[PDB]
Design a protein around this nucleic acid. Structure first.
Ligand SMILES: [Zn+2]
Ligand SMILES: [Zn+2]
Ligand SMILES: [Zn+2]
Length: 85
DNA sequence: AGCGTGGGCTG
DNA sequence: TCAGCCCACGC
């Protein structure tokens, strides 16, 4: 952890500089990415991409066992486990 | 379920 | 730096 967080009201530490810069947005409240469909702003581009799928209904990740589709890979990951029990 | 959102990390 | 994943946790 060669880089720490300046805001006295926070005890965070990171390995990289790009990480401390992305983190700082938590405190500055920066939300650079806007959804053109609902106008909601997001702190991250990747979260904006998946959020947009809530409007379009796009579901790229299908369960290997039943084929049920999901907007995000982690949603599918959480689901696949139910085929055990 | 639906889905917000930060951390770790790759490229 | 940004882009874009996985991963994780929360409600
Ligand atoms: Zn901080
Ligand atoms: Zn939207
Ligand atoms: Zn399934």
């Amino acid at each position: 952890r060669p880089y720490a967080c300046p805001v006295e009201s926070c005890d965070r530490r990171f390995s990289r500089s790009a990480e401390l810069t992305r983190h700082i947005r938590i405190h500055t409240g920066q939300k650079p990415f806007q959804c053109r469909i609902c106008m909601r702003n997001f702190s991250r581009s990747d979260h904006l991409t998946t959020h947009i799928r809530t409007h379009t209904g796009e579901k790229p990740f299908a369960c290997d066992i039943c084929g049920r589709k999901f907007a995000r890979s982690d949603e599918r990951k959480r689901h696949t486990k139910i085929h055990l029990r």
